[PDB]
Amino acid sequence: MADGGSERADGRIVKMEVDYSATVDQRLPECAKLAKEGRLQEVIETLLSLEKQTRTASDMVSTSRILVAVVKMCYEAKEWDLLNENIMLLSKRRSQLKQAVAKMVQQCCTYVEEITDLPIKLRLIDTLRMVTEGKIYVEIERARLTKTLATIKEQNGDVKEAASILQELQVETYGSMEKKERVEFILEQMRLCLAVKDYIRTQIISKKINTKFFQEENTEKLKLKYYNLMIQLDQHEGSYLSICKHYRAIYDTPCIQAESEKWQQALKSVVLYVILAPFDNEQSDLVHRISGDKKLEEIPKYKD
Amino acid sequence: GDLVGVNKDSYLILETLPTEYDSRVKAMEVDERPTEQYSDIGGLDKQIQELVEAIVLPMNHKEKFENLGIQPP
Amino acid sequence: RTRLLDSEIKIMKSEVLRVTHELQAMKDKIK
Amino acid sequence: KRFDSEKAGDREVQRTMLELLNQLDGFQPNTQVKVIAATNRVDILDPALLRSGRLDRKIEFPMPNEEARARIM
Amino acid sequence: KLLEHKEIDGRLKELREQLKELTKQYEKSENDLKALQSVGQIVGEVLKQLTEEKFIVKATNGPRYVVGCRRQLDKSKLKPGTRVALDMTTLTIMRYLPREVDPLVYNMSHEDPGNVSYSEIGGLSEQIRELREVIELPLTNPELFQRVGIIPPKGCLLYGPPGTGKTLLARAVASQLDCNFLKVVSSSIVDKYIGESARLIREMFNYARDHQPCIIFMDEIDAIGGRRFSEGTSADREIQRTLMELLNQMDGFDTLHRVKMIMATNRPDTLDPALLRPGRLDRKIHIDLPNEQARLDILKIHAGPITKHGEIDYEAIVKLSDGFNGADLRNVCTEAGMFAIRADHDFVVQEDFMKAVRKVADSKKLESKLDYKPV
Numbered sequence: 001m002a003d004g005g006s007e008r009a010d011g012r013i014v015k016m017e018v019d020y021s022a023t024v025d026q027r028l029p030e031c032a033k034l035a036k037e038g039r040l041q042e043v044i045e046t047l048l049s050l051e052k053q054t055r056t057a058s059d060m061v062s063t064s065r066i067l068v069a070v071v072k073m074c075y076e077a078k079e080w081d082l083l084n085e086n087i088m089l090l091s092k093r094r095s096q097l098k099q100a101v102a103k104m105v106q107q108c109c110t111y112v113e114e115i116t117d118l119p120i121k122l123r124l125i126d127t128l129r130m131v132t133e134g135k136i137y138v139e140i141e142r143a144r145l146t147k148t149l150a151t152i153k154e155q156n157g158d159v160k161e162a163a164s165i166l167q168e169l170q171v172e173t174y175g176s177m178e179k180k181e182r183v184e185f186i187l188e189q190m191r192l193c194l195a196v197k198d199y200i201r202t203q204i205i206s207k208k209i210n211t212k213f214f215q216e217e218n219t220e221k222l223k224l225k226y227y228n229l230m231i232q233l234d235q236h237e238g239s240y241l242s243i244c245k246h247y248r249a250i251y252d253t254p255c256i257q258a259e260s261e262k263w264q265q266a267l268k269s270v271v272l273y274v275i276l277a278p279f280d281n282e283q284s285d286l287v288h289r290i291s292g293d294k295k296l297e298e299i300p301k302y303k304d
Numbered sequence: 305g306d307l308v309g310v311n312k313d314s315y316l317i318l319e320t321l322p323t324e325y326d327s328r329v330k331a332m333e334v335d336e337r338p339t340e341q342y343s344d345i346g347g348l349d350k351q352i353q354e355l356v357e358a359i360v361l362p363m364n365h366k367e368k369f370e371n372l373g374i375q376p377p
Numbered sequence: 378r379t380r381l382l383d384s385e386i387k388i389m390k391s392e393v394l395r396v397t398h399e400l401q402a403m404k405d406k407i408k
Numbered sequence: 409k410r411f412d413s414e415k416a417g418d419r420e421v422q423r424t425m426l427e428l429l430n431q432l433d434g435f436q437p438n439t440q441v442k443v444i445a446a447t448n449r450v451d452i453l454d455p456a457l458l459r460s461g462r463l464d465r466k467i468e469f470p471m472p473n474e475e476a477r478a479r480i481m
Numbered sequence: 482k483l484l485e486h487k488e489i490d491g492r493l494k495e496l497r498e499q500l501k502e503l504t505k506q507y508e509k510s511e512n513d514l515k516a517l518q519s520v521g522q523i524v525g526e527v528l529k530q531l532t533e534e535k536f537i538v539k540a541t542n543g544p545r546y547v548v549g550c551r552r553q554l555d556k557s558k559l560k561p562g563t564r565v566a567l568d569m570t571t572l573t574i575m576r577y578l579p580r581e582v583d584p585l586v587y588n589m590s591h592e593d594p595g596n597v598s599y600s601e602i603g604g605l606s607e608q609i610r611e612l613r614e615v616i617e618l619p620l621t622n623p624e625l626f627q628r629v630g631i632i633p634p635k636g637c638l639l640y641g642p643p644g645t646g647k648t649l650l651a652r653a654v655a656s657q658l659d660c661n662f663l664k665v666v667s668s669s670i671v672d673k674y675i676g677e678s679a680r681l682i683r684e685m686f687n688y689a690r691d692h693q694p695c696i697i698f699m700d701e702i703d704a705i706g707g708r709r710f711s712e713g714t715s716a717d718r719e720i721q722r723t724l725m726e727l728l729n730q731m732d733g734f735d736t737l738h739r740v741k742m743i744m745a746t747n748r749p750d751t752l753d754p755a756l757l758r759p760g761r762l763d764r765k766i767h768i769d770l771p772n773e774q775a776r777l778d779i780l781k782i783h784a785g786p787i788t789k790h791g792e793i794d795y796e797a798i799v800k801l802s803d804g805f806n807g808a809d810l811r812n813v814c815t816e817a818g819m820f821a822i823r824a825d826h827d828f829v830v831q832e833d834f835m836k837a838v839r840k841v842a843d844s845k846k847l848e849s850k851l852d853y854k855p856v
């Protein structure tokens with residue numbers, strides 16, 4: 001009840017500054033019984049969000065001192081049992097997990113500078129179940145991008161983390177509408193396929209590239225910088241004729257630049273792939289479509 | 305689906321007829337409006353009240369409905 | 378002091394051209 | 409009330425009535441109309457004619473008990 | 482001494498505005514006076530093409546002719562069954578329009594309104610995503626199917642309790658693709674004739690053969706699908722022949738190209754098992770009663786334009802509810818607001834919502850037979 005969670009939520013904040021987690025063992029059937037009650041709209045969702053919040057104060061006590069992770073797996077053992085008793089059938093009692101687990105990845109944001117890999121990956125093997133099972137979120141999907149990116153940064157990318165992104169590419173493209181950050185995650189597996197050195201897997205994930213259209217409007221210069229990853233798709237391994245739009249996007253990035261060297265290799269890389277591209281109707285006209293620049297005729301190799 | 309005046313020779317759409325009167329409907333419109341005050345309705349006065357609250361006030365004041373902001377009946 | 382003279386000849390040309398706007402209007406409208 | 413049977417019944421009428429609902433409501437929904445229907449009985453009517461916005465109210469009229477008989481008489 | 486410049490300038494601009502307005506309509510009336518020379522062309526149709534310039538056509542109000550085109554009328558595009566406009570006197574072919582339209586199709590195709598997208602619905606993300614896979618993909622990219630090689634599927638059937646928002650989901654699709662929606666109530670087909678129903682079916686399927694990315698939606702199929710029992714009746718044999726117009730003409734000889742068929746019924750039991758084979762309709766997807774974030778999130782879409790306060794206990798409604806569709810939450814919010822009109826609470830109080838729960842959950846007494854599970 002509201003007063004029944006007001007007396008536990010208001011009456012159990014004092015004991016965290018002094019006591020060991022025995023009042024937390026005097027909260028496991030208290031959060032279990034308050035969740036079995038579970039006021040169906042905004043009451044004990046928010047009261048249990050307060051009680052999981054003071055549980056994260058007990059995480060500042062217990063899971064910030066020794067990092068035992070047995071205290072953690074008991075805490076997500078009662079989160080396991082607390083996700084077990086009530087259905088949550090698109091039922092809306094969920095802020096007990098929202099800012100609780102959002103503060104857990106806030107804690108992991110305070111852990112990656114301090115923690116070793118084993119208890120934080122036990123936290124990750126908890127929250128894989130918690131978020132892929134408990135009503136898939138949006139912002140712990142981007143914290144999923146940084147937590148499986150944290151598993152990448154464990155060994156700085158390999159075939160196993162290439163599998164860890166290949167299992168998480170297109171799962172949450174249709175549940176949560178998104179245009180920016182998972183698009184900044186879809187650029188991440190291409191170096192997880194160049195470290196593998198697999199051009200055809202680079203073209204399978206390039207089939208994953210062109211399922212994300214309307215690249216524009218996302219931020220100011222998101223995609224002008226992303227075009228470096230669009231040109232890394234087939235840069236040195238690319239063909240001679242399938243590279244026209246590929247060796248177009250080399251040039252639109254220093255179009256902002258008033259430089260005369262990297263914008264100059266934008267010119268020379270927008271003109272010397274005609275030497276790549278064989279006899280073409282698209283050759284003999286685009287050599288005069290791109291002709292008209294002021295700095296282009298100022299190369300004797302362009303005269304050549 | 306309109307009655308129009310068309311030249312016999314040029315076959316040009318000349319004018320629109322003001323004679324689209326629609327048989328039976330325009331005859332279905334009761335133009336006499338016989339009188340019946342509410343003194344004749346004896347026994348259904350609560351139905352007069354819910355009748356007026358349902359029907360008569362949407363004709364007069366939808367601001368009575370949509371300053372509250374839902375719908376009319 | 379000659380802009381009023383050129384705009385004035387353009388105003389008599391506006392009366393003649395408006396008479397031909399009522400001749401292009403009215404006189405054609407007759408037929 | 410519609411049927412699933414053969415050599416009997418009407419599949420027409422309801423075209424006029426779902427065209428009534430069709431032209432009236434939904435297609436440029438404007439609150440410039442009041443639908444007033446007075447059926448003798450209800451049990452013949454379709455359930456798709458009375459739902460929530462077709463006819464919102466179900467106003468029954470009971471028997472004139474004593475004094476509405478003397479009154480209307 | 483400069484008032485004469487504006488004194489002739491304003492009169493010159495006034496006579497210029499009246500000159501442009503009067504002489505402009507004089508020029509439009511001159512175009513009408515030239516249009517007095519313009520001739521009403523003849524409505525006809527091509528019976529068949531005989532030679533390169535001999536065209537067997539027929540006057541629409543009578544006799545038959547053989548004439549030719551103007552100079553540049555693209556005679557190859559004249560195919561028998563098209564409509565032409567002819568000269569009046571010389572009677573040779575002047576133009577061709579579309580073909581024909583049969584405007585019973587008009588009053589239900591462009592009748593379709595635009596909607597809010599699938600944010601309006603909730604708790605159907607499996608249906609949104611997988612039904613999105615079976616519908617939206619071969620118009621966005623049918624070549625991933627062709628990278629595989631395999632032909633994309635054709636259509637599906639939604640079921641469950643009636644009024645759970647099958648029509649509402651179809652309107653969400655009507656908001657999503659926004660292109661070519663041909664949505665038929667699919668019981669107004671049998672007027673009193675036999676093949677008139679079929680002829681409307683052929684005309685709709687020919688219009689669907691015309692436009693490439695056509696979308697079909699049908700509802701209440703049981704008045705037009707039916708079941709073939711032993712023939713002893715005399716009015717749903719018409720539904721058997723019309724049903725066979727569906728049996729052929731969902732397949733035909735030519736498959737339909739980008740013509741999706743979205744089917745929704747209330748009882749999918751009494752339909753023909755000949756229809757129930759896949760390929761025609763790929764899958765029967767169940768739509769349930771609304772869950773608690775469907776009642777709630779759909780209720781909060783319905784709680785949008787409401788002059789409420791910090792009072793609204795929604796679980797009084799939802800936990801005092803027991804499964805209520807989007808129009809039933811229109812009933813809850815609407816008639817709760819009607820209790821807000823009661824005693825003229827210009828604001829919105831929560832206690833009227835529980836009153837709406839009393840009235841509607843009270844009014845569930847007249848309704849039974851809650852399910853129809855196909856196949």
Ligand SMILES: Nc1ncnc2c1ncn2[C@@H]1O[C@H](COP(=O)(O)OP(=O)(O)OP(=O)(O)O)[C@@H](O)[C@H]1O
Nearest residue numbers: 601602603605643644645646647648649650807808
């Ligand atoms: N899954 C859903 N998501 C969002 N809104 C829904 C959903 N289901 C129903 N609704 C709401 O219900 C209302 C009616 O939906 P719809 O017209 O599809 O009913 P129906 O399923 O066609 O019912 P029936 O076929 O029995 O007439 C719509 O306004 C819609 O907003």
